[PDB]
Amino acid sequence: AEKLGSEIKKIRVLRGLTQKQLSENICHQSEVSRIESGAVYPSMDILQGIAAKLQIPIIHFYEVLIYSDIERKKQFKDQVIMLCKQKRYKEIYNKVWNELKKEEYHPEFQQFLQWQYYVAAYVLKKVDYEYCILELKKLLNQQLTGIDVYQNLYIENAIANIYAENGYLKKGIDLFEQILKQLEALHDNEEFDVKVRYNHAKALYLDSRYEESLYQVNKAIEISCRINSMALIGQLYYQRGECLRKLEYEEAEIEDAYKKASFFFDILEMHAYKEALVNK
């Protein structure tokens, strides 16, 4: 693997250090030479040292270890993610399709493209909910490992959303509960937790379980405030207003929730979402 090597050399030159300087208290300068030429994989001790001195998150050296064009792929991923957030499914569909037809080998990145492409296809009504789900399940059946440990959970969340908005509330709700459970086990990804609770809350609400919906909503609002996340907080206040209405709370409490939602939709420029707020 010569890709790791030149990434280390590139960043060392960029930092103005020589091999001798870099090797200090870590290893011999000749081992740095051999690491940069690709002739050797470094041990944990040595890598940890090099990453520290160069001020590079260690996962970076693993990322560039096998597949190419890692910086561009990461910006691509963040772009798609932003667009998905904005519900710009047409663009996602085109953007991801273009990338997909390069036919490059990189299972985890290819899986990400396919996941996003299918969801986009489904939202655009180019494919039916049942076919989307089956394709998504097939990505799962890949049992793909990968750098991003949460990718399968993200695919399960899409699957659960699609069951839920096509009448299969029980199946959707049970899948949401499984995701929250699998999350208990994994390291903290609290933004995702908030997102799953939100979708789950929507499904509970569609199933007329108003109290449980509000439970999930308030839990997710609490998590959002504690981590200072605005990603879903507008939607959550809106949802909580919905629950408050069905549960027959006082009009003021109901109005409060919707005002808080309208606040976030405004400042975050969520134009689409602003419609739902008619007559409340």
């Binding site: 998905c84 519900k87 899409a158 908005e165 939100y198 979708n199 569609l206 939607q235 979402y273």
Partner: peptide
Amino acid sequence: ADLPFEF
């Protein structure tokens, strides 16, 4: 049910 599910 105007707000979409979040993918």
